[model samples]
Every structure is written in C-alpha cells, then in structure tokens.
Target: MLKQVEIFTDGSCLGNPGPGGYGAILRYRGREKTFSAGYTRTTNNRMELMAAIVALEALKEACEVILSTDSQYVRQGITQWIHNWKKRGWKTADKKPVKNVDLWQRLDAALGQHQIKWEWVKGHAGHPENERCDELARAAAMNPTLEDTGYQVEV
Candidate 1:
C-alpha cells in the first residue's frame, strides 16, 4: 500500500526580479508538514517551481502524491506541456526558449521520481492552507531571519 499525500504550494517576489520566497504545505495520513525559503534575488516563477521541488524532495519515502499550486506555469509545464518542450529542446510552440529552463528541468527531474497529481488553485482566494503559505512566502521574503528556511518535515 502506498501512503497518500496532498501538498499546497505558493511563491512570491517583492519585486518582479527582486527578493523572492517559496512555501509548501504537505498533508499525509492526518499529519501536516510545511516548508518555506527565500532568496536574495529571484523571480516568482523560480520560487514557485522551487517550492514544488523542495516539497517533493522532503518526502521521506516515495508515495502517491497530489501536489497543488497556484502557479499555472508550474502546473501546466509539469502536467501538460513538459514532454513537448523537451522534444523541442526546451523551446515553446513559438520557437522561443523557455524562460526558466533551469528550474523547469530541475522540477521535471524531481517530479519524475514520484507518482504525482499536479493541481492548480486560485491564489489569495481564502483557502486556509494556501493563505498560510502565501503569508509564509511573503514574510520570508520581507524579513531577514535565517539564512535559509531549512526543509522541515513535520506537522
């Protein structure tokens, strides 16, 4: 039997290419776990993909997982369009190189290791966990506390 898991993730940037942060909340077998981190300079898309990769990486054992995020970029790339991008050498249908290919590749590799269901949620629409994650991401980006928000695996 496989453990069932669900995760919610979010990312934010203070400026378009300024300080950024990512957050993830994972729930499994009635327990909840959260992870968040920030970078001095980055984009929201990078942080969004990072949150998903970091959250999946923290799973102690590979399990069937449902990862939900509010990022269309993250969800669509992984679930819908990655294979085509790979075949095209990471170029889009318009023959343009993907913007965050590095992060996308990392995320694609991380996702290949697990059986996952990627989902997209609306951001800041009053979902409790999503709201919490947004708060965490913004807080981490705004304040200088720890050097890195370590991968935390707990409820």
Candidate 2:
C-alpha cells in the first residue's frame, strides 16, 4: 500500500482585504515540498481556501491525503458546510451567496481526485508544521505585492 501524503497549510493577510498570501507543505515518502504565493488584495478566508487549493493542485497524481490546516473556515467548510452550500446552489447558511465561491469550487475539484482526511490544528499554538506554514505565509504576504486576479470583491 502507498503511504498517505501529509499536507500542512496556512494563510496570512495584512488587512482583511489587503495584501494576503498562502503557504503549504507536503510530505511524501522521505521528501517534503513547500509552496507560497502572494496576492495584492484578498480576504483571509480566500487565502485560507487558496492555501488548500494550491497544495492539492501540486499533487501529480491521485493519492490519499492527510491534510492539516489551522483554519476552521477551510475544515468546516469542506467537511460540513459544503454540503449545505451545494444543496443551496452555493448559498451560505443564511441564504446569502457564499464567500470565496471561486476558491471553494476549485478546492472541490482538486479534492474530487484524491481521498483526503481533513484535520484541524490550533493556530499559533506551537505546532511545528503549522508554525512553519504560518511563517511561510506571513513572509509571502510581506513580499513585494503581486496582482490578485479578480480579488476586488468583498465578503
């Protein structure tokens, strides 16, 4: 049997809709890979969801994944809230259009090709992987600004 791939991810933002970034770390076999990207303007939830999307998109093939994240926005959205969102044609619990719908759809497509175990970790609580991802994300957010495509919308 193949070993499950492990992934850790995080996101950071200077302001809710200001510069933002995402970070991800993936481990398989004896190797680990990391990714980070910056956006000129985006929301915390968008970056959070984008972190997972970017991480999953890095996979070269369909494989079982043990994905860990500190964002309940990502975890609960994936495991619980997504069902209702889909049922309501991507509307939120309050019947409003869901936020980050673009990233959510991308995440769903990325997930369809892999078996994933979504796990949540407490942020800034001294977890090594989570901390590392946070560092990467914050660093990226501090990098020279990069244009965030279609990121003008607000939540």
Candidate 3:
C-alpha cells in the first residue's frame, strides 16, 4: 500500500508584480521537507502555482499526493477548471485566454504524473505546517534570495 502523504504550500509577492517567493512543505512517514525559492519579479498567483509544481516535481517518483494550498486560483484550476480550459484551448469560462497559461501548463504537466488530491485551506488559520510555509514564502519575497531550502529533489 502507498503511504499517505501531505503537502502544504504557499506563495507571496511583495508588491504584486515585484519580488516574489514560493514555499512548500511535504510530509510522509513522520519526515518533513520544506522547499522555497524567490524571484525578483513575479505575481502571487505565479508563485502559488510554482510552489505546487516545485513540490510535485521534487517527488522521487509518482505517488498518491495530497497537495494543499490556500489559493483558490491554484486549487480550483487544478481540481475544477483545467479540463474545461483545455477543451477550449486554455481559455477561461468567458472564452478569454487564461492568465498565467505557461505556469498553469507547467503545473498541470507536473501534476499529471502523480495521483494528486488538491485541498484548499484557509491561510493564517493556525495550520502549523502551512503557517511555516507562509513565513518562508513571505520572508523570501521580502529579502529576494535565490537559495533553495534544501528540501527539493531533482526538480
């Protein structure tokens, strides 16, 4: 039987399009891993999706994953809207091209390789691991660093 795994992820942007960062925490078998990265310029949504992609990419091999995030855009896109968007050639429900298509595509591809269960959690609602990821993401956004948190695998 595959071990049950849990992941918490968050992203932050200092000025919406300014310094940005992403963070993710993976837990399995009593072990935890944290991943974080910063970008000089990016949006919060990009960072959010990027964090999820990074977390999944870090997996050693495809496995059942419960990926959690606070972003509705990220969770909803993956769990609900992606299929319709793909059917309409990546357009939104209104027939407009979706924003952040590239990042969404990358996240979609990474997610496709695993049996992922997406969950939405309330931000800053006292979830310990999620709170830690938020702190890491916000700190990286404010400081603008390229250092990896040493928690990710090849991707």
Candidate 4:
C-alpha cells in the first residue's frame, strides 16, 4: 500500500517579479517537516508552483499525497488545465504560449511519481498549517538569497 502524506504550501512575492519565496510542510504519520526558500527574482505564481514541486520531489518513494495550496494557478492548472495544454504543445486555448512552462513541466514530472489530490484553501483565513506556510513564505520573500535563474533568463 502507498504511504499517505499531507502537504501544505504557500508562496510570497515582494513584488510581482521581485524577491520571492515558497514554503511547504509535509506530514506523515504524525511527523512534520517544513521547508522554505527564497529567490532573488521571481513571481508569486512561480513560487506557488515551486512550493508544490519541492514538496513532491522531496519524497523518496512513490506514495499518495494530498497537497493544499492557495493558488488556483497551481491547483487548477495541474488538475484541470494541464491535459489540454500538453496536447496543444503547451499553448493556451488562444494559441498563446503558456506562462511558466518550465515549472509546469517540472511539476508534471514530479506528479509522475505519486498520486496526488490537489486542494485549494482560502488564503489568510486562519487555517493553522496554511498560516504557518504563509508566515514562512513571507519571511523568505523578505530575505531572499538565491537567484531565480529561469526568471533571469526570461527577462
């Protein structure tokens, strides 16, 4: 049987394409681990996606995951929008190139290793774990240390 895991994720941006951070907490069998990191330049959307990617990639074995996020972009894109985007060669219905295809592809690759249920939570609404993730994300965004290379390349 696959092990079951619960994850909460949040992302923050000081500005739309400025300092950013992603935070995640993974829980298994009553134990929890939290991760947060900052990027010198990135978007809130990118950080949101990265939070999920980081959480899934941290797993050492294939398992079941329930991942919670506040961003519809991450939750909806993966659970709903990705199939058609891939079929259209990563283009939107309007034939426009999808934004953040790099991270979207990475998230897709991570999904291959696990069965995931995506959950959307309302942000800043006092859910304990979600609030903690938001705290972590905001702190990281305020104190970024690493470069977001992909974001740099796009500019």
Instruction: For candidate 1, write residues 38-147 as lDDT tens digits.
Output: 78767677788888888887777667888777887787777778888888999877777677776777777777777887667776563688888888889878853443
State how far residue 131 of model 4 sits from its true place (Å): 0.5
lDDT of 1 at 140: 72
What TM-score does structure 1 among the candidates reach?
0.79
Off by over 4 Å in 1: 1-3, 28-31, 92-97, 124-126, 144-155
Candidate 3 lDDT by residue in tens digits, 75-139: 77777888888889988667766777777777778877788777788875737888888899988
Model 2: runs farther than 4 Å from truth?
92-96, 124-126
Q: What ranking emerges by TM-score with the best candidate at the front?
A: 4, 2, 3, 1
What would the TM-scores of all predictions be?
0.79, 0.88, 0.82, 0.88
lDDT of 1: 0.75
| TM-score, cand. 4 | 0.88
Alpha carbon RMSD to native, model 2: 2.3
Enumerate residue pairs that collide in model 4: none
* Winner on TM-score (1 vs 3): 3
Worst 10 residues of 1 by lDDT: 146-155
lDDT of all the models against the reference? 0.75, 0.83, 0.78, 0.85
- What is the lDDT, from 0 to 100, of the residue 46 in candidate 3? 77
